[PDB]
């Protein structure tokens, strides 16, 4: 019956410290600065994940500053935060108390893949649409996640609700101010990042998202490899070798290098024959060399592949109705407001 009380600040709320009690602590994972716990808030009985990160004594923690501003049904909610000692002696850790979500897109995808079954397309639609909304939302603040991958897509597999998490690499990108190129995880990295660009844009998240879509359709990553060399070969095998004009749009330092000379594989042969053609069309507009030619997240939400979700009679295969899909805010719609008349159907 072990109960722990700390002074913590609500993640949103007013900036007023309060007493927070929790219990039933258990290890659920490990992060870069110590293990990740589950706990149960005594007040409400709700489950939270508690994650530790390093507090820099010179600047404010960027991940905390971003999470305090975010309020969206497809992004993990920051419930509280507080400071403590930790794994390394003499160190002060930031603890981020997040709403707990028990599964991820990756687990669901591996479950199907290992059974040699295709994830039913209605779930590919639901998951990718919610991912794109979360991206349109954070991108409308200038914020790029920089680490989109299936393991960062939390999932309630009963309601089909998805929530984007892990804002440890996220950054408000300012044009003309360089960024480190070494973010984003193996298999999901845009080619401009593989080339070491420091002047990239939020479209690196849309590439990563297209990689997640392709993986859901293929049952395995589309561009695997343990080095950027091997990853690039897999990209070139699908997209063909980039032209000098494309390389200049990615990283102009790379324009004159010798790359493998390979003609593009047709998109209709990248996926199995019965892949829905709208899914292939959408993929081909996300996995583009030229960063500015990729769909924006909000253009992706309005793509024809997601038309079934705007059908008034669409339901989950388990007979539940779909999660919330159309409660767009002005903020979320700000990159292009008149997509809302595709985005919000008459029945909403």
């Amino acid at each position: 019956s072990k109960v722990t009380t700390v002074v913590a600040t609500p993640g949103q709320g007013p900036d007023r410290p309060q007493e927070v009690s929790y219990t039933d602590t258990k290890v659920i994972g490990n992060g870069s600065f110590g293990v990740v716990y589950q706990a149960k808030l005594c007040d409400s009985g709700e489950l939270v994940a508690i994650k530790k990160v390093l507090q820099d004594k010179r600047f404010k923690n960027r991940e905390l500053q971003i999470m305090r501003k975010l309020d969206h049904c497809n992004i993990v909610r920051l419930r509280y935060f507080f400071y403590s000692s930790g794994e390394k002696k003499d160190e002060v850790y930031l603890n981020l108390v997040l709403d707990y979500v028990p599964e991820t897109v990756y687990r669901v995808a591996r479950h199907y893949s290992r059974a040699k079954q295709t994830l039913p397309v209605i779930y590919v639609k639901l998951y990718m649409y919610q991912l794109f909304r979360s991206l349109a939302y954070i991108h409308s603040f200038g914020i790029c996640h920089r680490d989109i991958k299936p393991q960062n897509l939390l999932l309630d597999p009963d309601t089909a609700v998805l929530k984007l998490c892990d804002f440890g690499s996220a950054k408000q990108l300012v044009r003309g101010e360089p960024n480190v190129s070494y973010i984003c995880s193996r298999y999901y990295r845009a080619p401009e990042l593989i080339f070491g660009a420091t002047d990239y844009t939020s479209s690196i998240d849309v590439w990563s998202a297209g990689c997640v879509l392709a993986e859901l359709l293929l049952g395995q990553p589309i561009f695997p490899g343990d080095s950027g060399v091997d990853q690039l070969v897999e990209i070139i095998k699908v997209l063909g070798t980039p032209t000098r004009e494309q390389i200049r749009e990615m990283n102009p330092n790379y324009t004159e290098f010798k790359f493998p000379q390979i003609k593009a594989h047709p998109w209709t042969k990248v996926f199995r024959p019965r892949t829905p053609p709208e899914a292939i069309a959408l993929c081909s507009r996300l996995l583009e060399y030229t960063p500015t030619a990729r769909l924006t997240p909000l253009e992706a939400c309005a793509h024809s592949f997601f038309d079934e979700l705007r059908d008034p009679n669409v339901k989950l295969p388990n007979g539940r109705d779909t999660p919330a899909l159309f409660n767009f805010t002005t903020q979320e719609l700000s990159s292009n407001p008149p997509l809302a008349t595709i985005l919000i159907p008459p029945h909403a």
């Binding site: 659920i28 994972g29 028990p102 599964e103 991820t104 990756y106 687990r107 591996r110 960062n152 939390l154």
Partner: peptide, 10 residues
């Protein structure tokens, strides 16, 4: 490589 140690899919 998984986010969590435990899954209903295991």
């Amino acid at each position: 490589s998984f986010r969590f140690l435990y899954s209903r899919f295991c």
